[PDB]
Each structure stands twice: as structure tokens, then as C-alpha cells.
């Protein structure tokens, strides 16, 4: 159970984004049905009034929370990976449009899942904005919680992988378009019952065997991190 509060651009808080530049759902419940249109941008996908301006090369930070800003972020049990995708905003998320910018599943050194590190980061994880064409984009941040993923939702709807999905409206102003955006994958559609990483037993299988769901990260992606960039208690 987790939601996005807002974003930071180069370490500067853009302010409460809920239903303003985040297409916020009503609550922090997971999406579980892989074929549902809710997989795109969660249960209340509509255009909201603002878009955050950024330039290529900026650091765009998502900030998640559980019930209130800068709380426990998400239950420790919800181990799983984090990914960020981008699509042109005009698609409204439909079609083969989502390109993956970031993936973090299990870091073998630190012996932590992406979610565990997100808690330590006070809910913050970032991507560097890529050199795509100026215009309006959706950034889709996705957490997969695996603690009931030994079952498939389609077989047993009280269990299954849990998807926490948030779409932010981002306007890219200045970019040299050195890496124009390719075609991507559809949501719903990219993940099926047989996709690696959707069904997994975290209690018996060692995390070093986990493979996160495709697609792989685009070669035009400029990186990112799970790491606190600003202190919500101050700004
Ligand atoms: C999943 O969503 C699809 C598409 O809306 C729907 O047809 C199907 O009934 C849902 N599955 C379950 C198990 O509720
Ligand atoms: Cu939860």
C-alpha cells in the first residue's frame, strides 16, 4: 500500500502533485489483474490539469508514501522490484508506447530488494530525463510487491503479485533529441501469467534467482537511483 505524493526536479520539490500532475487513484490499494485497463495508470486514469516542466539531463525524483508524507512509505513485507517507464502523452498510455527507463530488483551486495531501499530513501527514487523530443510525456512508476506472488491472481484472486502504479504528467522543454523515443510495450499486455517475475516465491526461492519482468531498459536511458534527494521535513 503505497502512493506517489509528488516529484522533485534537480533536488527541488515541485509540491503536492496529487490530482494535480499525478493521475492519482482514490486510495493506495494494489492493482492485481494483469489484463485490466487499470494496469496503465491505475484506477482513475484521466488528464489532470498540470504538467511538471523538465529539461533533458535533469534528475526527476518520485516520492512515495503510505498514509501521510514521509511515513513508513510501504510495508516491509512488500519486497519487490521498481521500474519506471515513459510514453508520449498523446497516446494516453494506449498502444505499444511504454519504454523502460529504469529497473532495480535485488541488489546482491547489500542483500536488499528495491522496495527495502525505497523505504530507507524516504520514498524517493529518480531517473535522469532522456534526450527525447520536447513535448508532453507520461512517466509511469511501478512497484511490484511479491509477498503473495506464489499464486497467480487469475487462478486465485485473493493472492497474486501486487502492482502500485503511478503516472505523472511531465513536459520536456529543452532537449537536443539525440535519442528519439522508440516504440515500446503496452500496459495492459506486457505482463502475462507466464512472464518471468510475475509468479515467484520469495520465501523459499533465493532472491538471486529473481528475474524482473521484461522489457529490458532502453539503451537511451541515462540512469537513476533509489536514494533520498531532499528532506520533506524542510521543503
Ligand atoms: C480482469 O480484467 C478484465 C478486463 O477488464 C476482465 O475481463 C476480467 O474479468 C478480470 N479478471 C478477474 C479475475 O476479475
Ligand atoms: Cu500493501
Author numbering: 1 to 235
What did the article's authors report about this structure?
Lytic polysaccharide monooxygenases (LPMOs) are copper metalloenzymes which cleave polysaccharides oxidatively and are important in pathogen biology, carbon cycling and biotechnology. The Lentinus similis family AA9 isoform A (LsAA9_A) has been extensively studied as a model system because its activity towards smaller soluble saccharide substrates has allowed detailed structural characterization of its interaction with a variety of substrates by X-ray crystallography at high resolution. Fungal LPMOs are some of many enzymes secreted by fungi to break down plant matter, namely cellulose, and release glucose. LPMOs randomly oxidize recalcitrant crystalline cellulose, disrupting local crystallinity and creating new cellodextrin chain ends that serve as additional starting points for the endo- and exo-activities of glycoside hydrolases.
Here, the joint X-ray/neutron room-temperature crystallographic structure of carbohydrate-free LsAA9_A in the copper(II) resting state refined against X-ray and neutron data at 2.1 and 2.8 Å resolution, respectively, is presented. No residual F o − F c electron density was observed for an alternate conformation of His78 flipped away from the active-site Cu2+. However, residual F o − F c electron density indicated that a Cl− ion from the crystallization condition alternatively coordinates the Cu2+ ion instead of His78 as observed in the structure of LsAA9_A previously solved at pH 3.5. The occupancies of His78 and Cl− refined to 0.75 and 0.25, respectively. The N-terminal amino group is neutral. The distances from H2O-eq and H2O-ax to Cu2+ are 2.1 and 2.7 Å, respectively, confirming that the copper ion is in the resting oxidation state, copper(II), and validating the use of the X-ray data for joint refinement. In the structure presented here, Tyr164 is positioned in the axial position of the copper with a Cu–OTyr distance of 2.80 Å. The Tyr164 OH group forms a hydrogen bond to the side-chain carbonyl group of Gln162 with an OTyr164–OGln162 distance of 2.72 Å.
